Amino acid sequence: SGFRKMAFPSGKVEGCMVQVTCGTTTLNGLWLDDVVYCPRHVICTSEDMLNPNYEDLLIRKSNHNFLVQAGNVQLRVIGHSMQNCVLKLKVDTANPKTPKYKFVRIQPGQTFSVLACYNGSPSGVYQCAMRPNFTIKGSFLNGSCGSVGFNIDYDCVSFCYMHHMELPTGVHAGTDLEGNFYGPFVDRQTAQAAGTDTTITVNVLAWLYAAVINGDRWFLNRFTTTLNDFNLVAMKYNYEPLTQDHVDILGPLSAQTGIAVLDMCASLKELLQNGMNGRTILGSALLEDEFTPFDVVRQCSGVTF
Amino acid sequence: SGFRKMAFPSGKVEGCMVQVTCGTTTLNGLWLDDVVYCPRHVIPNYEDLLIRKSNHNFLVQAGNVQLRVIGHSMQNCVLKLKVDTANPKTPKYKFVRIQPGQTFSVLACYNGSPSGVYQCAMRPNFTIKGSFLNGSCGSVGFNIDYDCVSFCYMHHMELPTGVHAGTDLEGNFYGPFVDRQTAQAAGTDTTITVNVLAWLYAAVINGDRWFLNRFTTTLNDFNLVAMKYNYEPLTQDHVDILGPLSAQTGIAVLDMCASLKELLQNGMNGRTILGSALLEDEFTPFDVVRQCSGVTF
Numbered sequence: 335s336g337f338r339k340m341a342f343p344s345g346k347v348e349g350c351m352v353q354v355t356c357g358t359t360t361l362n363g364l365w366l367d368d369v370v371y372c373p374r375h376v377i378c379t380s381e382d383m384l385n386p387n388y389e390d391l392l393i394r395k396s397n398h399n400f401l402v403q404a405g406n407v408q409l410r411v412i413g414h415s416m417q418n419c420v421l422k423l424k425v426d427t428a429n430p431k432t433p434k435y436k437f438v439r440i441q442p443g444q445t446f447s448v449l450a451c452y453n454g455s456p457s458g459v460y461q462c463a464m465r466p467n468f469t470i471k472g473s474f475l476n477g478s479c480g481s482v483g484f485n486i487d488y489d490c491v492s493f494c495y496m497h498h499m500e501l502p503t504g505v506h507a508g509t510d511l512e513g514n515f516y517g518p519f520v521d522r523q524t525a526q527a528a529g530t531d532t533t534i535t536v537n538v539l540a541w542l543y544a545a546v547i548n549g550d551r552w553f554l555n556r557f558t559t560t561l562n563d564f565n566l567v568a569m570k571y572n573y574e575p576l577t578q579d580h581v582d583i584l585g586p587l588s589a590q591t592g593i594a595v596l597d598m599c600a601s602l603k604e605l606l607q608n609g610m611n612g613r614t615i616l617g618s619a620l621l622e623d624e625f626t627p628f629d630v631v632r633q634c635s636g637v638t639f
Numbered sequence: 640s641g642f643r644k645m646a647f648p649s650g651k652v653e654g655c656m657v658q659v660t661c662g663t664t665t666l667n668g669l670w671l672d673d674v675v676y677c678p679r680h681v682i683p684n685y686e687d688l689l690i691r692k693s694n695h696n697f698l699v700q701a702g703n704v705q706l707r708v709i710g711h712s713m714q715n716c717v718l719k720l721k722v723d724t725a726n727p728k729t730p731k732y733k734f735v736r737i738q739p740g741q742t743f744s745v746l747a748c749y750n751g752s753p754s755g756v757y758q759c760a761m762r763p764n765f766t767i768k769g770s771f772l773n774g775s776c777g778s779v780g781f782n783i784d785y786d787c788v789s790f791c792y793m794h795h796m797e798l799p800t801g802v803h804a805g806t807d808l809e810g811n812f813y814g815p816f817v818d819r820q821t822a823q824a825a826g827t828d829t830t831i832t833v834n835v836l837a838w839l840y841a842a843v844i845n846g847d848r849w850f851l852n853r854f855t856t857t858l859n860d861f862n863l864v865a866m867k868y869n870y871e872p873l874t875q876d877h878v879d880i881l882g883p884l885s886a887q888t889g890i891a892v893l894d895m896c897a898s899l900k901e902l903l904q905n906g907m908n909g910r911t912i913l914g915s916a917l918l919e920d921e922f923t924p925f926d927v928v929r930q931c932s933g934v935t936f
């Protein structure tokens with residue numbers, strides 16, 4: 335019993351965190367095998383940031399300009415290349431602690447663990463979701479650039495995010511491990527704003543199913559709804575449209591609890607209309623959208639209470 | 640910017656998790672040097688049950704490797720299994736007992752294999768609101784003190800209400816609990832006042848000032864209000880501990896107490912503080928200072 339926001343054990347990722355220095359800038363890098371991955375803006379000055387020509391700035395750099403530190407040891411850079419917004423520094427030593435890994439690009443609504451680092455030293459781990467507006471609501475200070483987001487499903491570490499910058503609203507933007515940003519963002523100081531955010535409907539529904547599994551049924555009602563009628567209501571509360579894929583994905587949870595997906599949608603519609611009324615669902619006074627259907631089946635039991 | 644429930648990096652602890660089997664029971668153990676620590680319930684008159692056991696009855700697994708048990712003893716509710724091999728991944732550690740309100744990270748394990756990490760607080764009623772299934776027994780709670788891992792909790796059981804009970808690493812339970820199947824209930828819980836105040840200071844640091852007012856209160860008047868809302872009494876130590884946060888934001892502790900007093904009587908009024916519609920008590924003053932400064936491990 336019990337439901338918590340849980341992160342993946344950060345051990346396999348901690349053994350990869352290094353400190354990357356180029357001139358005055360210092361941020362984090364991910365040392366996998368003989369390559370260190372870090373944001374390409376490490377080559378930039380604060381002045382360069384408005385309209386930087388990265389290809390022009392990188393052609394001016396030599397391997398000895400990049401100082402890489404792995405613990406108390408200095409790694410020797412023997413090559414460098416750029417892949418989209420990530421800088422790949424070839425090093426002379428392969429990481430002996432390199433885990434089994436994959437570079438994966440995630441879709442909005444997907445969750446992951448963030449190992450926040452400063453000076454190549456991990457300071458904390460937290461769980462978070464890729465928002466529909468492609469931003470992440472993280473907890474980052476200056477020096478955290480290069481911190482990575484991952485999932486450790488089964489035994490392989492799937493790197494899905496690398497931190498790059500904080501937007502004016504306090505939310506964060508970054509790339510997959512191939513250097514492609516999530517969202518319409520650029521690694522530039524130009525006026526960039528996060529688009530209006532929405533609630534991940536499929537995740538709130540999964541979390542309502544987890545509440546039913548933990549014995550909380552107070553929000554359930556005798557109504558059902560059409561998918562179209564639920565989306566018309568949900569749109570007005572700034573909720574993401576629920577698609578037929580989302581419904582299919584909630585199938586296992588529907589079967590386990592005995593509550594049809596469109597039956598749970600009717601409970602959600604009612605919760606949106608009435609509010610919590612002094613009550614909580616899984617110790618929360620708000621509808622939680624940072625647990626995917628997969629997370630709920632992973633954390634929750636099989637014998638419903 | 641941003642405020643999250645953050646756990647310490649679990650790496651130093653993961654290298655210690657082992658699987659302990661005795662008969663049909665299987666739970667987790669903590670392998671530090673040549674000793675494996677686990678709940679004694681893996682084997683009631685515990686001394687009578689333990690005198691009947693031999694070293695080869697305890698099967699200990701560290702990854703794919705089997706560890707050879709060469710001795711066994713009991714310290715309170717923890718079973719200490721002496722093993723032939725010293726853990727090469729043993730970190731610098733201390734066994735510490737924590738006080739209610741203090742927070743820690745939990746590395747939840749099943750079959751000696753870590754599955755997740757989360758942050759939580761020791762409640763005033765000595766229970767922890769964790770996330771555990773069957774097989775999680777022996778999972779440990781810890782903090783990282785610079786470079787030294789401070790083991791403070793070991794999971795033993797789930798109470799009928801869904802909350803959890805356990806011991807420090809010396810086998811002394813937190814709270815009036817015992818390690819057996821009997822009618823045990825968690826006492827009425829209270830809100831950790833010093834932690835809510837620290838979290839209100841973290842909200843001010845993140846630009847959330849709507850709850851601030853021009854008013855102040857006496858410590859005595861605030862505690863009369865705290866007693867009425869099931870809040871733990873705020874002591875002069877708590878006030879002194881909130882000193883650095885008071886200085887950084889420019890809001891006196893008893894000024895922030897009059898903000899909490901108004902939030903207790905009137906509520907949030909459709910508003911949220913740090914994305915929360917409830918007053919959060921699982922961040923200590925030090926946790927707030929650590930997350931708003933960038934201390935690394």
Ligand SMILES: CN(C)c1ccc2c(NC(=O)Cc3cccc(Cl)c3)cncc2c1
Nearest residue numbers: 375474475476478498499500521522523640
């Ligand atoms: C201390 N504060 C205000 C900061 C400062 C900086 C933060 C940060 N880094 C940057 O933004 C660096 C940068 C600036 C301009 C363009 C790009 Cl692509 C990158 C990351 N995460 C959080 C932060 C928080």
Ligand SMILES: [Cl-]
Nearest residue numbers: 439440441444
């Ligand atoms: Cl995905």
